[PDB]
């Protein structure tokens, strides 16, 4: 599923991400835009052999099992394919574990390089939330 901007904002809000660990909703929408272009089916392979999955491009080296990342952890205890669903619940629940992990949203490279320090409230402007 390719979400609309306000559609995704409202789904993330319903799942408890607004101000989760201090990060306003606009941060999460901005990260999803630049990680996946709002597409739940996005995948991208990394040089180390790991793969990033779904709307928030969660990585198989630490967070999910894809059966082909040797010596990886599965800290969200899920198959990586579950992150590609049109229902974002699994992605959100795993993202909450990541952002609690220590370096916050800096774990998402696109957030650090394209969202951090910008006017992220613009990503929810106009939405009925
Ligand atoms: Cl933080
Ligand atoms: Na893994």
From Swiss-Prot:
Instruction: From the record, give the transmembrane residue ranges.
Output: none
Write out the annotated subcellular location. Answer: Secreted
In which residues is substrate bound? 101
EC number(s) on file? 3.2.1.17
Could you state one GO cellular component term attached to this entry? extracellular space
Q: Which Pfam families match?
A: Lys
What protein family is recorded?
Belongs to the glycosyl hydrolase 22 family.
**Which additional comment does the entry carry?**
Lysozyme C is capable of both hydrolysis and transglycosylation; it also shows a slight esterase activity. It acts rapidly on both peptide-substituted and unsubstituted peptidoglycan, and slowly on chitin oligosaccharides.
This chain belongs to which protein, by name?
A: Lysozyme C
* Organism for this UniProt entry: Gallus gallus (Chicken)
Q: What is the lineage of its organism?
A: Eukaryota, Metazoa, Chordata, Craniata, Vertebrata
